[PDB]
Every structure is written in C-alpha cells, then in structure tokens.
Scaffold this active site. Structure first.
Site, PDB file in Angstrom:
ATOM      1  N   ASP A 220       0.875  -1.331  -0.060  1.00 48.44           N
ATOM      2  CA  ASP A 220       0.031   0.042   0.033  1.00 48.44           C
ATOM      3  C   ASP A 220       0.744   1.348  -0.009  1.00 48.44           C
ATOM      4  O   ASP A 220       1.347   1.833   1.092  1.00 48.44           O
ATOM      5  CB  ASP A 220      -1.109   0.101   1.195  1.00 48.44           C
ATOM      6  CG  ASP A 220      -2.314   0.903   1.095  1.00 48.44           C
ATOM      7  OD1 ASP A 220      -1.972   1.947   0.203  1.00 48.44           O
ATOM      8  OD2 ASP A 220      -2.916   0.994   1.811  1.00 48.44           O
ATOM      9  N   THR A 221       1.048   1.731  -1.100  1.00 52.37           N
ATOM     10  CA  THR A 221       1.857   3.018  -1.333  1.00 52.37           C
ATOM     11  C   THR A 221       1.150   4.217  -0.594  1.00 52.37           C
ATOM     12  O   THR A 221       1.885   5.226  -0.407  1.00 52.37           O
ATOM     13  CB  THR A 221       2.186   3.458  -2.805  1.00 52.37           C
ATOM     14  OG1 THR A 221       1.224   3.510  -3.529  1.00 52.37           O
ATOM     15  CG2 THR A 221       3.112   1.975  -3.477  1.00 52.37           C
ATOM     16  N   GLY A 222      -0.130   4.234  -0.502  1.00 53.26           N
ATOM     17  CA  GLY A 222      -0.938   5.173   0.133  1.00 53.26           C
ATOM     18  C   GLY A 222      -1.089   4.952   1.638  1.00 53.26           C
ATOM     19  O   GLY A 222      -1.725   5.884   2.166  1.00 53.26           O
TER      20      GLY A 222
END
Ligand SMILES: CCCC[C@@H](CN[C@@H](CCCC)C(=O)N[C@@H](CCC(N)=O)C(=O)N[C@@H](CCCNC(N)=[NH2+])C(N)=O)NC(=O)[C@@H](NC(=O)[C@@H](NC(C)=O)[C@@H](C)O)[C@@H](C)CC
Length: 99
Positions: A25-27
């Site tokens: 999850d880059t966010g």
C-alpha cells in the site's frame, strides 16, 4: 518482483512466526495489521484513513518478512479492514512505483 495492478497487490508475509496476507500500500504511511498478539511492549496510537480515525496498538522494531524480503520496523495492530504494508516497511525492501 514486478507487480502489476489489475488485481489488488496482495502478498504473504511472516510476522511473529505466523503467515498472513497483506496489501502492498503506497498510500499508507504505516503498516497496519488486524488484531492479534505480538511480543513485547506496545503503546496506544490513532491513525486515519478515508473514513476517519481508529485506535491501534503500536509495536516497534518488529521483524516482518514480506514476499521473502526482510524488514524490521513499526507495526500497528488494530481493526483495519485489510492488512496493509505501508511505506515504513516498503522502503526497507526497496519498493518503488514505476511507469
Ligand atoms: C484499509 C483499506 C485498504 C487500504 C486503503 C489505503 N488508503 C489510504 C488513503 C490515504 C488517506 C485518505 C490510507 O488509508 N492510508 C492511511 C493508512 C494508515 C496508516 N497509518 O498508514 C494513512 O496513510 N494514514 C495516515 C494519514 C494520511 C491521510 N491523509 C493526510 N495526512 N492528508 C496516518 N499516518 O494515519 N484504501 C482505501 O481506503 C480505499 N478502499 C478500498 O480500496 C476498498 N475498501 C475496503 C474497505 O477495502 C474498496 C473495496 O473500496 C478507499 C480510498 C476507496 C477506494
């Protein structure tokens, strides 16, 4: 590996001796896992998402193996809808976005 995004980027991790599934999850600033026991001391924390805030337990310096790559860092444990590996550990395994 190179992972495309047609499907959710779910991978197997090892944490505390147990195998779990989690989303890369880059966010996410942080790594958040569903309620469970981990060894050692924790402290209370709050974190936010799209819908508001939740309470979590912050454990520091936890070893996590993520698709065969080692990381050691903070893991937040609490009522997340989905286990997520966030940037704190994605940086440790050398993950980048590319386009
Ligand atoms: C848990 C559900 C899966 C992961 C999550 C990651 N989204 C980011 C969005 C960025 C904030 C709005 C997130 O929550 N990041 C958090 C993760 C927790 C964390 N501590 O890392 C974060 O970085 N939080 C920061 C705050 C950043 C927020 N913004 C800001 N500071 N300006 C924080 N440290 O608390 N995705 C979602 O929330 C999305 N949900 C979904 O994709 C699916 N929903 C479900 C329930 O899975 C789908 C079925 O709708 C939303 C956006 C709808 C399409």
């Amino acid at each position: 590996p190179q992972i495309t995004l047609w499907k959710r980027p779910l991978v197997t991790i090892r944490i505390g001796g147990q195998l779990k599934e989690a989303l890369l999850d880059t966010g996410a600033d942080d790594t958040v896992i569903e309620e469970l026991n981990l060894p050692g001391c924790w402290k209370p924390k709050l974190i936010g998402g799209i819908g508001g805030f939740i309470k979590v337990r912050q454990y520091d310096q936890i070893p996590v193996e993520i698709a065969g790559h080692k990381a050691i860092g903070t893991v937040l444990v609490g009522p997340t809808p989905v286990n997520i590996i966030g940037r704190n550990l994605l940086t440790q395994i050398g993950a980048t976005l590319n386009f």
